[PDB]
């Protein structure tokens, strides 16, 4: 789901905001 | 800032800090 989108590929502050809303 | 790798408890800690005073209201789980 959400962990892979920062774990197996890099993520941004805008993604770290979205993971709080999802 | 530049985009970075984060997994598990470090991905939770980073999303909680970027979400400021909100974060999760419940205990965290990997998804």
Two tokens at A2? 């959400």
User: Distance (Å, rounded) from C-alpha A3 to C-alpha A9?
Assistant: 10
3 state SS of B4:
strand
Sequence-distant (≥ 6) Cβ neighbours of residue A19 within 8 angstroms? A2, A5, A6, B11, B15
Judge contact between A6 and B5, C-beta under 8 A: yes
Contact A10 B22 (CB under 8 A): no
CA distance B28 to A1: 14
Closest approach of A12 to chain B, Cα-based (Å): 5
Approach to solving? NMR
Side-chain-facing half-sphere of B22: CA atoms under 13 Å: 9
Which residue on chain B is closest to A16 by alpha carbon? B15
Greatest C-alpha distance within chain B: 29
- DSSP states of A2-21 as a string? -SHHHHTS-B-HHHHHHHHH
Residue numbers in B near A4 (CB within 8 A): none
The CA distance from A1 to B2, in Å, is: 22
């Amino acid at each position: 789901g959400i962990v892979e989108q920062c774990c197996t590929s890099i993520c941004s502050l805008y993604q770290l905001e979205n993971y709080c809303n999802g | 800032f530049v985009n970075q790798h984060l997994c598990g408890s470090h991905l939770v800690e980073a999303l909680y800090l970027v979400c400021g005073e909100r974060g999760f209201f419940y205990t965290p789980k990997t998804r």
